[PDB]
Amino acid sequence: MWENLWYLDILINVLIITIFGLISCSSSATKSYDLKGCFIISMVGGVYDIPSAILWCLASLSILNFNGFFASLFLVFTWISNLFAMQSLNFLGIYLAFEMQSLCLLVLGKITANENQRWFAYRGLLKYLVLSLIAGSIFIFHASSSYLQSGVMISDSLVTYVFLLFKLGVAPFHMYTLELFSVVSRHVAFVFSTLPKLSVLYLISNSNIGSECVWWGLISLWLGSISQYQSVFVRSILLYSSVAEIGLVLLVLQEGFSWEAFSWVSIYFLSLSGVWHANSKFVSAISVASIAGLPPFLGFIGKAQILKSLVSINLGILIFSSILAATISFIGYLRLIRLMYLVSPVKWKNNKDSSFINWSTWMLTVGTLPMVYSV
Amino acid sequence: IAFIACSVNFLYASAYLNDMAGMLFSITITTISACETALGLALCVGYFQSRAANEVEALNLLK
Amino acid sequence: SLLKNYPPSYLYPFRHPKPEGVIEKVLFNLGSLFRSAGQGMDELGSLMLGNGGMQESVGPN
Amino acid sequence: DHDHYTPPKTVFEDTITINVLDYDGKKHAVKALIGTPLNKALVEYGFSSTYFFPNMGYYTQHISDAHVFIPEEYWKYVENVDLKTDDAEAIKLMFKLVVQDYQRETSFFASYLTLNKEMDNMTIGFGPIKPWHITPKWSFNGHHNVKDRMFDRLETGPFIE
Amino acid sequence: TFNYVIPYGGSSSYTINNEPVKAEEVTVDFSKEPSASSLKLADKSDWIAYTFNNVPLMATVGLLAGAHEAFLHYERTPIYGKRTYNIIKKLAPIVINKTAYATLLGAIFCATDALYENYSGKKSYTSGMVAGAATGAVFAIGRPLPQPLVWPLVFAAAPVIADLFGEVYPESMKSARGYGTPYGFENLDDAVPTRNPIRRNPHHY
Amino acid sequence: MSLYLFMLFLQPLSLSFVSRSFSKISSLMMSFATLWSAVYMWFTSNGANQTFYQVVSWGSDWSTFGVCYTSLYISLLCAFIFPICVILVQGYRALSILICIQTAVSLSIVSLHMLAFYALFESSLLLFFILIGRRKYGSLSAAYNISIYTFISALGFLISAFWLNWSFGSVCALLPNEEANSFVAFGIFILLWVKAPLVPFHLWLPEAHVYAPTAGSVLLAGVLLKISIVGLHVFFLPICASSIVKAFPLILSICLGSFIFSSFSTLKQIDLKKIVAYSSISHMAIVFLSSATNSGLGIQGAVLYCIAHGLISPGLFLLVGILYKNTNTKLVFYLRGLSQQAPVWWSVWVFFMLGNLAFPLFPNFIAEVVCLSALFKNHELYAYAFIFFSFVGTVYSSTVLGRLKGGVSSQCVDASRLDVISWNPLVLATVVTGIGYM
Amino acid sequence: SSRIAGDTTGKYTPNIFSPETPMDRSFSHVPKNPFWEAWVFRRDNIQREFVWTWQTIFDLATFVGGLYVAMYATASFCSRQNDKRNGYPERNYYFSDSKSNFVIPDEREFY
Amino acid sequence: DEPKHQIPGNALDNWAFLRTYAKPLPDMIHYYYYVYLFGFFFVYKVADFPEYSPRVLVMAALIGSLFYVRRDWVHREFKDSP
Amino acid sequence: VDSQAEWYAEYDKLEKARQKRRIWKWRDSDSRDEYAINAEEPVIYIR
Numbered sequence A: 001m002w003e004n005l006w007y008l009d010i011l012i013n014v015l016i017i018t019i020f021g022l023i024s025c026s027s028s029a030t031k032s033y034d035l036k037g038c039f040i041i042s043m044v045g046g047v048y049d050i051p052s053a054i055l056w057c058l059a060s061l062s063i064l065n066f067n068g069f070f071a072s073l074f075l076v077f078t079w080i081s082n083l084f085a086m087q088s089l090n091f092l093g094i095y096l097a098f099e100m101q102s103l104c105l106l107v108l109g110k111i112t113a114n115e116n117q118r119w120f121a122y123r124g125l126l127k128y129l130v131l132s133l134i135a136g137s138i139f140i141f142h143a144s145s146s147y148l149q150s151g152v153m154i155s156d157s158l159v160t161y162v163f164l165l166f167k168l169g170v171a172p173f174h175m176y177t178l179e180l181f182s183v184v185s186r187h188v189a190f191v192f193s194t195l196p197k198l199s200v201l202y203l204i205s206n207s208n209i210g211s212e213c214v215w216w217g218l219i220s221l222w223l224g225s226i227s228q229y230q231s232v233f234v235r236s237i238l239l240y241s242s243v244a245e246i247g248l249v250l251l252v253l254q255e256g257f258s259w260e261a262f263s264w265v266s267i268y269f270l271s272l273s274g275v276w277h278a279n280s281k282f283v284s285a286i287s288v289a290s291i292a293g294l295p296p297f298l299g300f301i302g303k304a305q306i307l308k309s310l311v312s313i314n315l316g317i318l319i320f321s322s323i324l325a326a327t328i329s330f331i332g333y334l335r336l337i338r339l340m341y342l343v344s345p346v347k348w349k350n351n352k353d354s355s356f357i358n359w360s361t362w363m364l365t366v367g368t369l370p371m372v373y374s375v
Numbered sequence B: 001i002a003f004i005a006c007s008v009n010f011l012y013a014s015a016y017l018n019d020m021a022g023m024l025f026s027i028t029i030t031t032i033s034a035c036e037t038a039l040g041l042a043l044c045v046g047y048f049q050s051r052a053a054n055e056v057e058a059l060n061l062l063k
Numbered sequence C: 001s002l003l004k005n006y007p008p009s010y011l012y013p014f015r016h017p018k019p020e021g022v023i024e025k026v027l028f029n030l031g032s033l034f035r036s037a038g039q040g041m042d043e044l045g046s047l048m049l050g051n052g053g054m055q056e057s058v059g060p061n
Numbered sequence D: 001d002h003d004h005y006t007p008p009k010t011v012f013e014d015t016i017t018i019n020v021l022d023y024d025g026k027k028h029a030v031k032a033l034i035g036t037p038l039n040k041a042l043v044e045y046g047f048s049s050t051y052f053f054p055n056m057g058y059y060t061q062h063i064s065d066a067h068v069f070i071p072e073e074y075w076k077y078v079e080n081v082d083l084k085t086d087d088a089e090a091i092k093l094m095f096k097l098v099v100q101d102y103q104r105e106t107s108f109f110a111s112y113l114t115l116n117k118e119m120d121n122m123t124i125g126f127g128p129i130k131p132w133h134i135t136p137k138w139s140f141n142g143h144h145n146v147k148d149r150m151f152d153r154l155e156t157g158p159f160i161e
Numbered sequence E: 001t002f003n004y005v006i007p008y009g010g011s012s013s014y015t016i017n018n019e020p021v022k023a024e025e026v027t028v029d030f031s032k033e034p035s036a037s038s039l040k041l042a043d044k045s046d047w048i049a050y051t052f053n054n055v056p057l058m059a060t061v062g063l064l065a066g067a068h069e070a071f072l073h074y075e076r077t078p079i080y081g082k083r084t085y086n087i088i089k090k091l092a093p094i095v096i097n098k099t100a101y102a103t104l105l106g107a108i109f110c111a112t113d114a115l116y117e118n119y120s121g122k123k124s125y126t127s128g129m130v131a132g133a134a135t136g137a138v139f140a141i142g143r144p145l146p147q148p149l150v151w152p153l154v155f156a157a158a159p160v161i162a163d164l165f166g167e168v169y170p171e172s173m174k175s176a177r178g179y180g181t182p183y184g185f186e187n188l189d190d191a192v193p194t195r196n197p198i199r200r201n202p203h204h205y
Numbered sequence F: 001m002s003l004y005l006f007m008l009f010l011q012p013l014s015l016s017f018v019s020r021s022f023s024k025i026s027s028l029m030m031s032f033a034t035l036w037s038a039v040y041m042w043f044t045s046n047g048a049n050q051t052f053y054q055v056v057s058w059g060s061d062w063s064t065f066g067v068c069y070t071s072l073y074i075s076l077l078c079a080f081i082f083p084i085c086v087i088l089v090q091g092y093r094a095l096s097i098l099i100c101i102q103t104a105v106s107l108s109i110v111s112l113h114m115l116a117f118y119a120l121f122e123s124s125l126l127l128f129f130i131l132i133g134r135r136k137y138g139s140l141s142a143a144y145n146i147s148i149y150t151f152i153s154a155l156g157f158l159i160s161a162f163w164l165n166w167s168f169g170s171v172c173a174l175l176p177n178e179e180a181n182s183f184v185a186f187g188i189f190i191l192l193w194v195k196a197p198l199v200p201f202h203l204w205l206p207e208a209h210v211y212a213p214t215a216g217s218v219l220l221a222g223v224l225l226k227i228s229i230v231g232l233h234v235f236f237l238p239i240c241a242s243s244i245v246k247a248f249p250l251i252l253s254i255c256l257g258s259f260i261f262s263s264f265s266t267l268k269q270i271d272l273k274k275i276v277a278y279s280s281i282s283h284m285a286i287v288f289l290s291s292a293t294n295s296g297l298g299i300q301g302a303v304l305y306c307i308a309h310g311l312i313s314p315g316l317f318l319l320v321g322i323l324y325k326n327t328n329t330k331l332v333f334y335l336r337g338l339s340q341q342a343p344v345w346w347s348v349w350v351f352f353m354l355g356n357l358a359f360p361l362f363p364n365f366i367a368e369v370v371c372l373s374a375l376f377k378n379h380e381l382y383a384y385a386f387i388f389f390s391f392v393g394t395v396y397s398s399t400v401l402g403r404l405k406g407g408v409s410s411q412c413v414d415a416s417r418l419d420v421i422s423w424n425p426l427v428l429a430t431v432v433t434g435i436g437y438m
Numbered sequence G: 001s002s003r004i005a006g007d008t009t010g011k012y013t014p015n016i017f018s019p020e021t022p023m024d025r026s027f028s029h030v031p032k033n034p035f036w037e038a039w040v041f042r043r044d045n046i047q048r049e050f051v052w053t054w055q056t057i058f059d060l061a062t063f064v065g066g067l068y069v070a071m072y073a074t075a076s077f078c079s080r081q082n083d084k085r086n087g088y089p090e091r092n093y094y095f096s097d098s099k100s101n102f103v104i105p106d107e108r109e110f111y
Numbered sequence H: 001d002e003p004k005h006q007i008p009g010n011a012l013d014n015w016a017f018l019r020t021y022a023k024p025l026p027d028m029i030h031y032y033y034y035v036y037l038f039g040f041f042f043v044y045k046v047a048d049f050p051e052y053s054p055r056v057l058v059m060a061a062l063i064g065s066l067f068y069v070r071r072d073w074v075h076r077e078f079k080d081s082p
Numbered sequence I: 001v002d003s004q005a006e007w008y009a010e011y012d013k014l015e016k017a018r019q020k021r022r023i024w025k026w027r028d029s030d031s032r033d034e035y036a037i038n039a040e041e042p043v044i045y046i047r
């Protein structure tokens, strides 16, 4: 019964915080900082390893910039779903966790839209829903065939590999991100383009979900780079950068380089924090430099990990493609710098809520030299 | 309909193997599908309430 | 108005009413200590600042 | 050397009025300066923010455009654009995403028309526009019912919201 | 060297050789050997057989391209309006022609490759360059002036890239290990492994 | 060494704490103090220590810094030419950009780690993208050109560095490693091919020089082109000699073609800065080929000729910038009668143009003699090819001088006291090196 | 109509309101010509008038590629002569197909 | 006045060419739905594909890239006609 | 200033760093499923 207590404490924590927030709901505290701190404390009871501590760190940094009890509660729900995705041992765990996370995404997207933004945000949420239904239905049908044929539910199969390709957002499965994250709140796009990936990477590494095929990561890299270079809108540029990088990280993870992808996801979270929560041009400039992989900042270390892992596996086509696609993506990042300082006078909203933005920029500048051992 | 088809396949496999895994996965499918449909119907109703007068078949995006 | 249970800090932001709980009283005394220490540090800084000390006062109407 | 200096004209002489048909069907007399682009003159008058959309070019989104209907006689003053460049790309996306079926042979975008003396008492109309989205802040639901002004928008252009 | 007086680098004696020493005591391999199907498809002995084995890839690619274009057309046609013309009569030529022309280009490429290798008798870069040149020439039969030059060059360059990074690159860096002692330098005192690291199992997807 | 590195780190540090009205004065004092620290580094560098004069490490392989013959010459050259850049540039933004660029470049020269070299050298990527693409007088196309060219070449170099770090376990120069792989050799080579402008990867340099400010052009020509030879002597020749000897006919083909076609392209120029920028490209090929011979003469001659170029081309760029300030034109056809109108500017212009044509009393002569001797050691025809086509440089230099020299002009455009102060150190250094104090 | 802007004493002030035009650095600026400016624009943007013609391909190949081919042949001949001169075995150059592995001479060996 | 690039073509003809992009725009879910479905089934079938030579794979990729039609190209040129 | 001692100390530091890196590069799979490759690792599963 003692082993069950570890999981049960997290429930009891979440429930009592929920009922306390429901009772203590007032206009005097619309920004419920106290429940945010309570949620952060409660999520410490789920840390058991380094990857779980990274999950906690990103979850807390995300919950800081959500406003209200309700959105923070659904971020806690996303954290629970992610924690169970890491611990899933067969098909049922994978399914339960990931469509719980999909439900949390739908709710978070719906509740952060204004009345004037409903026409496009609800359309994007609906399109995401239907595509996710396609993915889940195919997954569970093939899972039924596999469970019939083998008599057991084993998470080392092609079915879960393709389902996790959909979850990662690689090669033919990246369009839901483009449609949904273009029309949703910037924080929602930021937290759901970084945090979900860590659980999928952990599941792939631990449960041996790797394929010999390199087509999908190659397609992700080339398509992401070329579409980023051809995209006029800034949101599409940032969204396609993730497709390219996650294709490259998928190629690295299949070969067993778990440590490097676990560092890359964290450095990418920190790098994307500043450009998505754009309040200052200089912070966004450093963030864009970090995403490009540029040397003075921590983003150079994260990209260097992946590239260094590539030369070890000694696949020439991947390296050649990596160089050319990296140049193509660099052109789009340079477009982003040009738009801020070299096109026209720029005036932005004075949204002085840089909770972890200054800390993230400081970490990007500073952290390069301490982490140099990694590469 | 498709989710029900998959859940029925899992129940069929459970009967074939005399195992309880498919029964559990099927109740899981029922719950998750119902929750997804409720949220999606919420989004559909909200989408239809925000339609502008000029928009004609808002629900039929596939046209 | 609809509700009458609004927190006193919410109703009187300019000056909170006299502390009534023990914790509130301790916070009040700690604030008094902080105020005195801050004024002392202010005067010490004003000595280095030179003639005038960057002092400020209310102006006449 | 030292030819005669030409004194400048006062604002009254170099103001032309254009009659603009708005979406509701009312006709507005928009006083405008010669040498100004049509988009700027329309923005300064006080038309609502739904009436305008950013120029959908890589580096032109700070400019605010409108879908306008130009009489055949004034088609000459519209600016030529090179198809092999990206200005034509801005124009093609603005037709593809905003105008769509509402296009007519008189359809043009305001930035490519510059007001001059011969365009005095010209009658133009705002062309119908389809719902468009770039960012949640910069979007058009399809309802022309906000009473703000595009003038009162300090925000230069679309970036991450 | 880092000095201006004597040449940089060094030289190794050609007379002196160093006995090979194993990177580890026991070798466990997670890299699977080529399948018999791969060796069958790679076999260029009979040019007709080689062509017929490798064309399904080209036909598949042409079918996806034609399906993409045909769906772009189908998506546009209005369901609400009844159409006098038959849509499939419009759409079938697209897919069929795309697939046929793709298959023809791939057939020229594979046939010329196998024929050149048989006649030359050696596996070389030149077979791929000549097959690509012929395929690009077929691509630009009636096309305007830059294209007679550019397509033979691009189609010839593609097999060069495939050979350089698909065959030469892996074979050049087989020996390099990354663990224990550097492949050239075993005299240096580095931790010597009993077994090689297995970072992943042999794949089976 | 430690003092030099500390002062290099101190210069960008000072800008954060200065009053923003004292910035120019503080920056000039910091530049001169860095020059003095470089002189101290030369003093504490004993020739008895033949391999490396000085090596310092600050806790990791990346923090390993050291000076050799090439590194010491290039670092003294950059520290010498930086103050002139400082005085030429006005504004806190411009000062900040130029100081950060110089700190990164000067740290690259003394670095002994390929990855740290890459990290420091490419840190100045956006700074040039912003600098060359400045609001009124900059061009976005040139900034795009330079940024993309640098990114692709440096990424290839980075991939080769990763492979070396995986195979050997180290990528520091002080650890002896040799490789025969051609892919890694090309990965290291492509950076040198692009950074040292070598046909057909030379297109970025012209557009950058024309649309960069005079201080920016001075730094670019003075030391950023020389970073190629630091990379070649430090990170390519020690490890990739087998590949340079395998590809020597190809290397000569590309180098001599760059020399010839850059000389011919110079003839078609109407802009003074473009003329100087193309002269630089033709000059780089002799350096690259002389080093590639991997002989004692070649390395010394290449580093010497780099010093000669880094004393002659900054002077020409500075004089052209002064003339453009006085005239607001760079077209040779607009500029006439400069001999009568600007006798003092004309004297220095002719002196530096003679230096660029490698006349005996100039350092370019000694440097060229050594480089040609190395080429002659390889083969007679190699030297003969370079010696003949040097006449093309004379044609365009003489045409430019003749066009500027005489005519009718109604404007006195001659340099002020500030301008003469700006070039006096370069003239003195040119004379001192020309008499043999190379 | 003109006045001296510069003051050596250090009491320099820019008279932006002065009726007389200051003799500042812009005083000596070259007047410029409309057609010369258009010639400069044409000459810089000469890529607009680039057309692929058989004559253009002929010129580019015969001069550029011809010079590259000639230089490569001469360099290969010089390498062959030097190998015969030095007494080295025929070196394995990149595009030469040689069944010898000799690349770098051994300093210790006597050739 | 400044030297400027010559723009080929007439102003109204170029504007008429650009106006051929203003056509009824389908929503992208219809394409995405089919691509997702056929892509899932395609990934399932790929594991069963025979191993192809790298040269043939690269040539197939080149042919696919050449044969790919941008969605805007069909948009401008689409005619609801036989 | 003993240049010989400084040179040898610096070289020793770099060589030690290389040895440490090559030890650090010796990595088997840490996957929880992979009990064969890690048979000797001391672990407890709570599942």
Ligand SMILES: CCCCCCCCCCCCCCCCCC(=O)OC[C@H](COP(=O)([O-])OCC(O)COP(=O)([O-])OC[C@@H](COC(=O)CCCCCCCCCCCCCCCCC)OC(=O)CCCCCCCCCCCCCCCCC)OC(=O)CCCCCCCCCCCCCCCCC
Pocket: A041, A042, A044, A045, A047, A048, A049, A050, A051, A053, A054, A056, A057, A258, A259, A260, A262, A263, A264, A266, A267, A367, A370, A371, I030
């Ligand atoms: C203070 C001492 C700390 C030193 C050691 C730490 C261990 C003791 C933990 C003590 C707690 C200190 C926390 C520090 C680390 C946290 C780890 C941890 O906690 O669990 C690990 C620890 C044992 O796991 P392990 O040591 O990792 O070994 C297991 C296996 O080796 C499997 O694990 P593995 O994954 O490590 O396997 C080895 C791995 C080797 O992996 C490594 O080498 C690790 C490298 C270090 C990375 C460090 C960064 C990680 C970021 C997380 C930040 C920590 C957040 C703290 C969260 C917990 C707070 C207590 O090899 C791999 O290949 C796997 C890949 C690993 C990931 C790749 C690393 C990249 C990380 C990302 C870096 C990217 C840069 C970002 C920017 C950085 C710029 C400077 O578990 C515990 O000891 C118990 C956990 C209990 C936590 C909370 C429970 C107490 C409170 C309960 C009630 C709570 C409610 C009341 C609240 C009260 C307050 C109000």
Ligand SMILES: CCCCCCCCCCCCCCCCCC(=O)OC[C@H](COP(=O)([O-])OCC(O)COP(=O)([O-])OC[C@@H](COC(=O)CCCCCCCCCCCCCCCCC)OC(=O)CCCCCCCCCCCCCCCCC)OC(=O)CCCCCCCCCCCCCCCCC
Pocket: A171, A172, A175, A178, A215, A218, A219, A222, A223, A226, A227, A230, A317, E061, E064, E065, E067, E068, E071, E150, E154, H034, H035, H038, H039, H042, H057, H058, H060, H061, H062, H064, H065, H066, H068, H069, H070, H071, H072
């Ligand atoms: C009934 C349903 C209809 C669909 C039917 C099929 C259903 C799917 C079934 C299975 C799907 C899985 C496999 C399909 C391919 C995966 C792509 C995908 O699914 O992404 C979702 C994608 C939609 O995603 P999206 O985000 O909405 O669209 C992004 C674009 O911006 C879209 O916007 P955009 O169209 O306006 O812009 C297109 C843009 C987008 O950019 C791309 O397309 C990127 C593609 C680059 C290659 C991709 C990686 C190739 C690696 C293949 C790996 C296998 C081989 C391994 C070895 C190869 C080594 C490289 O590219 C272009 O601008 C046009 C050029 C296209 C290729 C560019 C490269 C040219 C190189 C040739 C040089 C020669 C020129 C020399 C002369 C030049 C003179 C100066 O759906 C599809 O497009 C599927 C259509 C299937 C047709 C593909 C035909 C061939 C397929 C195999 C050949 C592989 C080459 C790829 C060709 C282009 C494919 C896009």
Ligand SMILES: CCCCCCCCCCCCCCCCCC(=O)O[C@@H](COC(=O)CCCCCCCCCCCCCCC)COP(=O)(O)OCC[N+](C)(C)C
Pocket: A032, A033, A034, A036, A037, A038, A040, A041, A044, A057, A063, A064, A065, A352, A353, A354, A355, A356, A359
């Ligand atoms: C080895 C370290 C390197 C590895 C890095 C990963 C490890 C991270 C370790 C350091 C983490 C530091 C994180 C810094 C976050 C910055 C603090 C912050 O965000 O405060 C917010 C917090 O905002 C909130 O929402 C408050 C609610 C939560 C308050 C904090 C909750 C504390 C919970 C307890 C956590 C204790 C840990 C539990 C036991 C481990 C306040 O900012 P705002 O008011 O929202 O806006 C700022 C406006 N402006 C700056 C422009 C003036």
Ligand SMILES: CCCCCCCCCCCCCCCCCC(=O)O[C@@H](COC(=O)CCCCCCCCCCCCCCC)COP(=O)(O)OCC[N+](C)(C)C
Pocket: F435, F436, F437
């Ligand atoms: C705005 C400018 C106005 C001012 C004009 C200044 C006028 C300059 C006067 C011209 C000077 C000509 C002197 C040329 C000789 C160079 C001086 C020299 O190099 O000093 C020699 C000492 O030699 C002499 O003193 C030479 C004596 C000069 C007087 C001899 C007769 C004068 C006739 C001139 C002919 C000189 C031709 C030399 C050609 C190279 C240093 O001796 P070392 O210790 O051995 O130095 C090492 C050698 N190395 C420099 C290469 C590193």
Ligand SMILES: CCCCCCCCCCCCCCCCCCCC(=O)O[C@H](COC(=O)CCCCCCCCCCCCCC)COP(=O)(O)OCCN
Pocket: E120, E122, E124, E125, E126, E127, E153, E154, E156, E157, E160, E164, G095
């Ligand atoms: C990125 C490399 C792509 C090449 C770019 C070249 C320019 C593109 C123009 C397209 C022309 C088609 C590509 C031809 C390039 C091959 C070079 C021709 C040399 C040659 O014919 O020898 C072959 C071997 O060279 C070879 O085929 C292998 C040589 C590898 C090519 C050169 C690699 C470095 C070039 C990088 C230059 C700068 C990069 C910028 C593009 C024959 O050999 P054999 O074995 O068949 O013997 C014959 C027994 N029958």
Ligand SMILES: CCCCCCCCCCCCCCCCCCCC(=O)O[C@H](COC(=O)CCCCCCCCCCCCCC)COP(=O)(O)OCCN
Pocket: A229, A230, A317, A320, A321, A324, A325, A327, A328, A331, A335, D058, D086, E161, F141, F144, F145, F148, F149, F152, F153, F190, F201
């Ligand atoms: C297995 C893979 C098989 C091979 C597949 C190959 C596929 C293609 C790979 C090409 C990768 C190279 C990436 C560079 C692309 C060229 C630059 C883009 C052209 C361009 O328009 O950029 C504009 C300016 O760039 C400029 O002004 C720069 C001018 C050109 C730069 C020169 C290129 C660098 C040197 C090339 C070779 C170097 C050595 C190679 C080893 C800015 O466009 P915008 O920001 O306004 O966006 C608006 C969108 N239209």
Ligand SMILES: CCCCCCCCCCCCCCCCCCCC(=O)O[C@H](COC(=O)CCCCCCCCCCCCCC)COP(=O)(O)OCCN
Pocket: A311, A319, E164, E168, F156, F159, F160, F163, F181, F182, F183, F184, F185, F186, F187, F188, F189, F243, F244, F247, F250, F251, F254, G093, G094, G095, G096, G097
């Ligand atoms: C066509 C003229 C050549 C243009 C180059 C002009 C001069 C450049 C020389 C640079 C000097 C050092 C570079 C090493 C070799 C580079 C190219 C040498 C010529 C070459 O391509 O030889 C090939 C061998 O090299 C190879 O197999 C690899 C070639 C380079 C690969 C291209 C891109 C690599 C990028 C890798 C990034 C870093 C990766 C690090 C892991 C084939 O000659 P062969 O011996 O097969 O003879 C068969 C003939 N019948």
Ligand SMILES: CCCCCCCCCCCCCCCCCCCC(=O)O[C@H](COC(=O)CCCCCCCCCCCCCC)COP(=O)(O)OCCN
Pocket: F381, F385, G061, G062, G065, G066, G067, G069, G070, G071, G073, G074, G075, G076, G077
């Ligand atoms: C598509 C792009 C290309 C299309 C256009 C290409 C047309 C150019 C073709 C002609 C180029 C000039 C001729 C050089 C190549 C000759 C044929 C190559 C075969 C060859 O190497 O023969 C050697 C030629 O003599 C030599 O060693 C070279 C003599 C000619 C060089 C001097 C003439 C020009 C001088 C100008 C200065 C250029 C060189 C500066 C160093 C002598 O045979 P072998 O005894 O060496 O044995 C070597 C065994 N084949």
